[PDB]
Amino acid sequence: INIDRRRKDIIRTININPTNITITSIKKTEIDGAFEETETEIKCVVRIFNEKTAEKQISSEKQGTFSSIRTYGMLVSNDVILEVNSRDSLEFECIYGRMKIVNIYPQIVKGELCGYQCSLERID
Amino acid sequence: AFTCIYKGTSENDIVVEEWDAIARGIRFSVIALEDKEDTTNDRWVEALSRHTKDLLEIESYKDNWKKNFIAPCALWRTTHIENKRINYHLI
Prior knowledge:
This is part of a larger assembly, with chains A and B.
Chain A: H1 3-16, E1 19-31, E2 34-47, E3 57-58, E4 67-69, E5 73-77, E6 88-92, E7 99-109, E8 112-120, E9 122-123
Chain B: E1 5-9, E2 15-16, E3 21-22, E4 26-29, H1 43-56, E5 59-60, E6 73-74
Parallel strand pairs in B: 5-6
Antiparallel strand pairs in B: 1-4, 2-3
């Protein structure tokens, strides 16, 4: 498979049903054995699609209540480098509860990045 | 009849999300389930319960509680008994 084929396919698939998204990244930086969080905001064109027929979990407790579902995936081009770790997070404000990027699958051809297959979690 | 007594409250003020409710358990208790008589063969207890009822104009439940006590009330009971032959003719 050639890199141009993958690039064309990713861009086409995103352009069938794109949505402009405002990713917000909170990166935790170790400072004196604790975290100092630097917040940055980055924008990308994105297509969102169902991937898993999962069930909405609920986690009510004395801290508070929130329900999250794992169904939605995501597919984004090469325009911006992404990364999600324990110390790094990515979220964005979809209208139906803000999404959260759980795991990143970087699509690579011959050691060259071309786009990120990605997974989400719709936090209600 | 019976007479519940307030004792406290459940461990915390729980929240149940699946039922969409909040709950709290009040904790009561009842006394002397088995007793139903309110009588005594201790003549001294009977005498002092009579004295308390006459003087004080409240109940006097004798040697042990009963489940349906009417507050306010008293209770005369014996704890310890010491007999003694002080003399040939006297005890």
